[PDB]
């Protein structure tokens, strides 16, 4: 298994493309996005991104860039969880996530 | 970053308003909810609720499970998280960036 | 609360039924699945499974069987998180989750 940080961004859908580009620019290998409802008839339609990064610093770069640019004007939350990646050709590279010495 | 508990509730879609009302009464500052499938495929719902304290998460969990989960299908679990940005979650005080 | 392992599988939607068969065959008590979008405009419709297991080996058996059968030919990521289950009759049994 490979150590990973899982960054979650829940925010307004209008920010989809701008947050996707930030993610791409960060060096993150991929991301998952989903339509969600949220509250912070009072529910609103939101999107949630999940991004697995190899380092906490990469996760924080994305979080910091999204927030500084958009979180004054747009609703949002960003949080981070620990995870271990078991399989993922781009995340772990060709030798896989359980390579030996 | 501010320590958080991420409470997740996966249950029958018909309980959406009922469960949102409990979350709204709890003191939690928000919630995300999404349409999902499952078995435990039926179309159901998943809530995620970030709370500042484990105690708030567990009060939500207890209230929801006792009121509904002997009569409706449901699972409730909790994960650790850290909040990096969140105006209402961390307050005007911010997410204590240097801790 | 009962310690649990949260296995996540994000992969191509066409594999929905093939993966669900594997989850069931592993002994897992259930799963959640949802429609997602992934990059890895260049977002393609895909699926995410979340599976809570009592043991780490059960989660890894699901992981190993899905990846070996499919990940040479289909895109995917599988990762794992700690969790605790608070309520869940099938997960915890009739005594509850403590
Ligand atoms: N405490 C929380 N727990 C879970 N989700 C949250 C929390 N606070 C805010 N959110 C999500 O972040 C979203 C921000 O935009 P909305 O307020 O439309 O809806 C909010 C919720 O979906
Ligand atoms: N062990 C598990 N892992 C992930 N999801 C679960 C598990 N057990 C139950 N569920 C989810 O919780 C839901 C409760 O309603 P269902 O029985 O319709 O469908 C269930 C699944 O989506
Ligand atoms: N680093 C990552 N973080 C979050 N999700 C990812 C990551 N890499 C791949 N994925 C997801 O795994 C999916 C595999 O199928 P796709 O390429 O269609 O889209 C991919 C993303 O949804």
The alpha-carbon gap from C67 to the nearest alpha carbon of chain A, in Å, equals 7
> Would you say the CB of residue B29 lies under 6 angstroms from ligand 1?
yes
Question: Mapping DSSP to helix (H, G, I), strand (E, B) and coil, where does residue C69 land?
Answer: helix
B82 and B88 Cβ atoms separated by less than 8 Å: no
Q: Determine the Cα–Cα distance for residues A53 and A60; give it in Å rounded to an integer.
A: 10
What is the CB neighbour count within 10 angstroms for residue B43?
A: 10
Angle separating helix axes A56-70 and A16-25, nearest 10 degrees:
140
d(CA A92, CA A44): 36
Nearest neighbour of A52 by CB, restricted to C37, C77, C82: C77
H or E stretch covering C12 = strand C2-12
> How many C-beta atoms lie closer than 10 Å to residue A7's C-beta?
27
> Domains along chain B?
1-99 (3.30.70.120)
Q: How far apart are the first and last CA of chain A?
A: 14
| Nearest of C46, C40, C42, C45 to residue C10 by alpha carbon | C46
Distance from CA of C19 to the nearest CA of B (A): 12
Q: Is A50 helix (H, G, I), strand (E, B) or coil?
A: strand
**C-beta A44 within 6 A of ligand 1:** yes
CA B6 to chain centre: 6
CA distance B15 to B74: 10
In degrees, to the nearest 5, what angle opens at C-alpha A54 toward C-alphas C61 and A24?
110
Which residues of chain B are within 8 Å of residue A58 when distances are taken between CB atoms? none
Resolution of this entry in Å? 1.8
Select from A33, A34, A83 the Cβ nearest to the Cβ of C81: A83
Longest Cα–Cα distance of chain A, Å, equals 56
Q: For residue A79, how many C-alpha atoms fall within 13 Å in the half-sphere facing its CB? A: 24
Experimental method: X-ray
B52 neighbors B89 (Cβ within 8 angstroms): yes
């Amino acid at each position: 298994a490979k150590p990973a940080n899982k960054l979650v961004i829940v925010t307004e859908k209008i920010l989809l493309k701008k947050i996707a580009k930030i993610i791409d620019e960060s060096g993150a290998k991929g991301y998952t996005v989903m339509n969600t409802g949220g509250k912070g008839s009072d529910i609103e339609a939101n999107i949630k991104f999940e991004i697995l990064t190899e380092t906490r610093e990469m996760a924080e770069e994305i979080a910091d860039r999204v927030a500084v640019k958009y979180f004054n004007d747009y609703a949002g939350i960003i949080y981070i969880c620990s995870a271990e990646v078991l399989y993922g050709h781009t995340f772990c590279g060709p030798e896989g996530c359980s390579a030996w010495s």
